[model samples]
Target chain A: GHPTEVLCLMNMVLPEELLDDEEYEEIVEDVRDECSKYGLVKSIEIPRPVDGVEVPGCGKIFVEFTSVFDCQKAMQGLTGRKFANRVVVTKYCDPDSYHRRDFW
Target chain B: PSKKRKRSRWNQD
Candidate 1:
């Protein structure tokens, strides 16, 4: 698959870990700060868990970069890296669908 | 050297 502006990260966060407000905020902030080292991050969407309704992309981190080059840099820097004792898997996501939040 | 926009999800609506 070709590179896209959106970089999808998986296996780094768990649904239980995102339930807490403080922790969730910390996670987002940490990711944003680290990803910024590679390039300009447009937006980062970390879907939260609802009470009953299941979120489509819960536990997955979607990072939208300003360009494919930036996304590729972050992907190369993050993939196979360890975060919170878990391995991070990075891949390019479809730009349109990522904005639409189609993370399943 | 180039300076780009710095925005975060927290700052967006």
Candidate 2:
């Protein structure tokens, strides 16, 4: 199985702050849609928000393609690209296992 | 205006 992955711009260095819940979901959907363009997204994972607990990976978006080729294509399109004001950084993260590592 | 709040910054463009 060629389950390669691509990560989107996370909360580390961003252009603007997440104003509200709608804003968060808005970006989540956008990221999913964006990655779908370059490859067959086997799984798209976005960090869910907690009520009071401070979540570390809230801003990160993970997209795993069926093949590494597709994964790389999406990464190339996203990495070092400026959408609004800040340039985005594309990195590698555990695909499908991201949630597992996040919680237990 | 101190600690970093749980923020999700994305490009609007």
Candidate 3:
């Protein structure tokens, strides 16, 4: 897929983990710290599980950077990288949809 | 009192 300013990371988190505030914050902080090394991160979003409602982006980490180049660099740097012992999967996302927070 | 030991890791194909 083509590169974009938004990067989607999968397999690094689980829905159950997102339910815990402590684990969730740790994940957010860890992701921010690690992703900042590749570029200027605009924002980091991790969809959390909600009672009864089905979250669209649950279990996925969405990172928005300043440029497509940064996202590409992150994709290369993070693919297959281990987080909490689980290998990560990285991919580029559509900026339009990303801006809309459409992660499904 | 006691001291701990030290330890430390990559992938290729």
Best candidate, lDDT-wise? 1
At residue A16, give the lDDT of candidate 3.
78
Residues A41-90, candidate 2: write the lDDT tens digits: 76665555455333554455566556667777667667666645767766
lDDT of 1 by residue, A1-103 (tens): 6886788888788787787788788778878887788889888888778752455547677788888988887788777667656567778888788777877
- Candidate 1's displacement at residue A96, Å, is 0.6
Give me the runs in candidate 3 sitting further than 4 Å from their true place: A55-57, B1-13
| Separate clash counts for every candidate | 0, 0, 0
Q: Model 3: how large is the Cα RMSD against the reference?
A: 5.9
* TM-scores (chain A) of the candidates: 0.89, 0.68, 0.88
Which model, 1 or 2, shows the larger TM-score?
1
Please identify which of the two predictions, 1 or 3, would achieve the higher DockQ against the true structure.
3
Docking class of 2: incorrect
After the best TM-score superposition of candidate 3, give how far the Cα of residue A76 lies from its true spot, in angstroms.
0.4
Candidate 3 local lDDT, A1-104, one digit each (tens)? 78766888888788878888888777777677767778888888788777524455577777877898878877897886666566777888776887777773
In candidate 2, position A30 carries an lDDT of 65
Each model's lDDT? 0.74, 0.55, 0.72
- Score residue A37 of candidate 2 by CA lDDT: 70
